[PDB]
Amino acid sequence: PLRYEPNNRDFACNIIDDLPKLIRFVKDSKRINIVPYTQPNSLWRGPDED
Amino acid sequence: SLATFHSSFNECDAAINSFEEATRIARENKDMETLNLIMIWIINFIEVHPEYANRFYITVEQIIKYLKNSSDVEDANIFSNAYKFETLLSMVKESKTAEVSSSLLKFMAITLQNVPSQNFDLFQSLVSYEVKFWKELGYESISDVYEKFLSKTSSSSLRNYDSSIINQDIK
Secondary structure (H helix, E strand, O other), rough: OOOOOOOOOOOOOOOOOOOOOOOEEOOOOEEEEEOOOOOOOOOOOOOOHH | HHHHHHHHOOOOOHHHHHHHHHHHHHHOOOHHHHHHHHHHHHHHHHHHHHHHHOOOOHHHHHHHHHOOOOOOOOOOOOOHHHHHHHHHHHHHOOOOOHHHHHHHHHHHHHHHOOOOOOEEEEEEEEHHHHHHHHHHHHOHHHHHHHHOOOHHHHHHOOOOOOOOHHHHHHH
């Protein structure tokens, strides 16, 4: 686990978070549907609800 | 058109008087479709001359709230016009980058979804905003790609005719 505490000397702001998250195109039998993008390995790496 | 012509010669104040009686005439015709045209001209004028925002009888934010929920049909280009004004205002109001990115996102998605070649005016405006937006963030690499799409000497209506020459000279 990384602990990246906010430091004044760190001005390295992040912009990827400000940019809206990407999505995915998956088409089922009925039609083409739109789902939020998840990384291929994100299912076992995603932030646990627990 | 006469209002545009005055704004073309930087008359500005005379153009203001010209525009007010256009509002009254629109009401007597009692036709809804022309009100969209008169409203869209407002901010286009104020986009060129932001110093005149207080003088209009309607604040800019009122229009955006109005045109966002104007309808769901028979608009086509209005929503494309609507969001770009919000993006410009959001940038000037120095709002958080998350909102500005989202607002530009809306206008980008709606403009490109329809034909962009035919709506040459808005497509150029998208490029100008995006180039400006990313330049403010400091990523010239992104700006470099988009600037190649910016048209030179094209300029726009209701803003003089030698403005392109002046703009080129400043650089």
